[PDB]
Design a protein around this ligand. Sequence first.
Ligand code: 5GP
Ligand code: 5GP
Ligand code: 5GP
Ligand code: 5GP
Ligand code: MG
Ligand code: MG
Lengths: 470, 475
Amino acid sequence: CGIVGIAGVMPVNQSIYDALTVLQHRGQDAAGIITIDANNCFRLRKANGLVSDVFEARHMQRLQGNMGIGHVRYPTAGSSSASEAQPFYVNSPYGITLAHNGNLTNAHELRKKLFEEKRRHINTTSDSEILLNIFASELDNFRHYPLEADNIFAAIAATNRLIRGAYACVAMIIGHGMVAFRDPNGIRPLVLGKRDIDENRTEYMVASESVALDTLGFDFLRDVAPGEAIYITEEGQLFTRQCADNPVSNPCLFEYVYFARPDSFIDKISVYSARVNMGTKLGEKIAREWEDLDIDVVIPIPETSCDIALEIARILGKPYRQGFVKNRYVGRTFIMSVRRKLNANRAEFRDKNVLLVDDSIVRGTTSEQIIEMAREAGAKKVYLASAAPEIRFPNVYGIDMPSATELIAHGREVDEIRQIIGADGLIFQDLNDLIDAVRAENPDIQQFECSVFNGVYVTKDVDQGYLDFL
Amino acid sequence: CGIVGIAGVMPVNQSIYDALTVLQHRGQDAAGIITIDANNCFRLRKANGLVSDVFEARHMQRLQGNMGIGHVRYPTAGSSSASEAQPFYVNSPYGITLAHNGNLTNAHELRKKLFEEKRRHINTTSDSEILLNIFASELDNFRHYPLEADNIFAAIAATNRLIRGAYACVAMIIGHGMVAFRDPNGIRPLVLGKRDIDENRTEYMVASESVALDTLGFDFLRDVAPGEAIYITEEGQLFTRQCADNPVSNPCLFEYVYFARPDSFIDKISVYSARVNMGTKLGEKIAREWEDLDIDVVIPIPETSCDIALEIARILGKPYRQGFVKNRYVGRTFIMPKSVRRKLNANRAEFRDKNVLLVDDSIVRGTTSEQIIEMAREAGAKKVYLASAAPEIRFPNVYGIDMPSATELIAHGREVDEIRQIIGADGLIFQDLNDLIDAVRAENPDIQQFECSVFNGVYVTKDVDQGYLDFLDTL
Ligand SMILES: Nc1nc2c(ncn2[C@@H]2O[C@H](COP(=O)(O)O)[C@@H](O)[C@H]2O)c(=O)[nH]1
Ligand SMILES: Nc1nc2c(ncn2[C@@H]2O[C@H](COP(=O)(O)O)[C@@H](O)[C@H]2O)c(=O)[nH]1
Ligand SMILES: Nc1nc2c(ncn2[C@@H]2O[C@H](COP(=O)(O)O)[C@@H](O)[C@H]2O)c(=O)[nH]1
Ligand SMILES: Nc1nc2c(ncn2[C@@H]2O[C@H](COP(=O)(O)O)[C@@H](O)[C@H]2O)c(=O)[nH]1
Ligand SMILES: [Mg+2]
Ligand SMILES: [Mg+2]
């Protein structure tokens, strides 16, 4: 999922659509935008589909207002993918809407408490409707009107004591403004930016990625700190206050590996640069543990791995060539597999021992089939290098990973995987290597959230119980 | 535009859609597919839009048959871009449909003759409806049923005598089969492939690009020769026959420069490799003519130039970094009471306090280039140099590449330095036509001459220059 929120001094409908389009890689199952018009009323458009399919002119026309949020949803299986989309809304207290990227690990416990204590009905399976409600109930506690920044921060604080997991949220309160907050372990991404229209007017915005500020011409200010909350009034006044008991930066590693765009700077780290670095280290590993290997060229499996493979070729002093081309358009198969996504440039494989480079291997299907494609194009020996370490555990913080059994690496040794996928050789990046590759870009980040690679969940509240429940 | 045709022994509806999705880069203005059912009747579906948007399940469900053709229309300005899409169809003789990529230079002359001579009404501006009518009238001249291959071939040859220009065409004749033919100068691309099923059951297909064959698992057989024609009967028999008086290979240079996919082999040339070569040459040209220039990195302008710039970096021994990212999804900009940044984003870190050499495939109107350069300056770039993989574009392509009017061409009537100034580049350098020709040629020396009208103003076909002289004979 991806989120954006603008606190402008002029129409934001187009800007949000535009920010959501550069954040579309984070989710295409559904999209939604909601603003607050001059009458302090919410205007909302949300449906399944791409951003470009969801918002038509009639819809934009209706999304009037100078403050608003948007959300693109990654088809989180389980949560219907045909279920109600975000942003979510509640009429009381005040009027609240919230968009969120992440996942609560105590969602069940939360909806039960909400039902018992507050009588708040949760219509969906989305733990975001849950978050919105916890946050709403905390704001229900205040008497005087309007709430003051502290009240709002106290509510976020109270909320953080209750919910557990990963989350980057942006929300809006009728008659008050916009609030954006981030979980205590700083897992899911969120950045703040601003745009001065003139000497006295300044707009603010937050997004899951810096690309969204970039495309709108907002100047990047900084990442929102772990546990921190930001409250921008309808008058453009900004407030920030730490709302978690023990904030620590454990940014998701996978954002760097695959999930995030290369032109984004998450937690001071350039995704591109980190990615090149993963190349350097992986090249070096191949060079250590595979010195006696005979390959004629390095071939990247587009897109992620394109610059990673180039680096690997540099390190190995071997030639880099584009053997695969990713189809820019993919059509559906009607009820009347990787080949529909990729095409092998025959001339680059014919009678060559090749080293293919991929960002990861989740299930192994793609990898096996890509390898078959190489063999069919004339390749003698086909070796596979994964820019990311083995993926053996599930992510429960907002990256939708297949079931533990679906993970080919799950319970299988590299060789057993190499065999199943039919590669002549298979090599993965060392977790420690990937860490250093990314860490090198900002050494103040000591630890990352790497549950998918090592079964260690920073929130320390995961066991087979939650897993099996899923 | 892009075309595909498949004479199969099993439903082709999915296979055509799949071939059109890999040919989508050739036109996204509209699409159309048309097959022949068991009852020897055409089933068609054409609308404006992307392949993915045009063909819904109800439509596919209706496209029954084992033979069909498809088309993806590049928004040809002038031809409405909201006009009737191809493939086109006529009920007589026999029942004919034709999909076409290219351009007729004597279209005006052609609809006049058709009206006058045969009373054939042309309902659109598409010279493709023209081409379908000429071919239809010529086939009309035959008495015995069915026509034999030679009759069809005779028809095509007759047609080639009449029309003038560039064209790759696939067509179908009810009760007969599929035909495909290419112009006498071999300009517009067309290839043939097959997919064997058994002891004699073999399917054939033609497409504007080998990628369509690859993706469908057809074995690449070969390009269709200039002026050649191909006829596959409904039974699976393949006939081929030269139908031009003086066939020559003058393939479009711009297909190699930009238009075609890198994984396609047009006229024995690999587009990728041709492209890389373009970098080599341009690198070397920069090294000769610029030597005293200080740059810190080579940065491509996605997507075409990515590998070209890589080579230019190699030759210049300068580092290559990805300073621009192409947005994968662009949306509508509504009209509430086309920006380059809507298409591209600059990776700030890669420009900050550096002198950059930006490599782009070409400069048409100059707007993009100008704005891309501003983007580089705003990202902290000190000096910004622009390299064009293609020579200066100063003329209009009247053969099938939609180029904006010659007034819009920034290169039209301007010196390199005047363009550099207009685009705000610290330095500007173009590829040499001769170098680019060698660059592509190096891949298949049998090609002695390309179609380069956009760059050299030399119109390979007959009627373009003769008519220049007819013009000056008035003023
Ligand atoms: N150039 C470009 N890359 C993108 C865009 N959105 C996502 N990406 C990158 O695309 C990759 C997609 O992975 P793939 O499956 O193509 O290897 C990810 O590494 C992601 O960073 C986009 O809009 N433009
Ligand atoms: N990877 C890939 N490249 C494509 C596809 N279709 C066209 N292209 C390339 O996209 C480029 C588009 O040019 P651009 O304006 O993006 O630089 C052309 O060089 C063309 O070869 C496709 O489906 N996949
Ligand atoms: N991890 C991941 N990879 C994806 C996704 N969609 C496409 N891919 C591509 O598929 C590869 C994983 O393929 P698998 O081995 O699961 O069949 C990745 O390298 C990536 O480029 C996605 O949603 N998640
Ligand atoms: N020649 C050409 N370039 C196009 C087209 N659509 C996008 N482009 C991109 O735009 C550049 C030309 O931009 P112009 O100078 O016309 O503003 C090319 O380098 C190419 O990447 C098109 O239809 N034709
Ligand atoms: Mg991959
Ligand atoms: Mg370009």
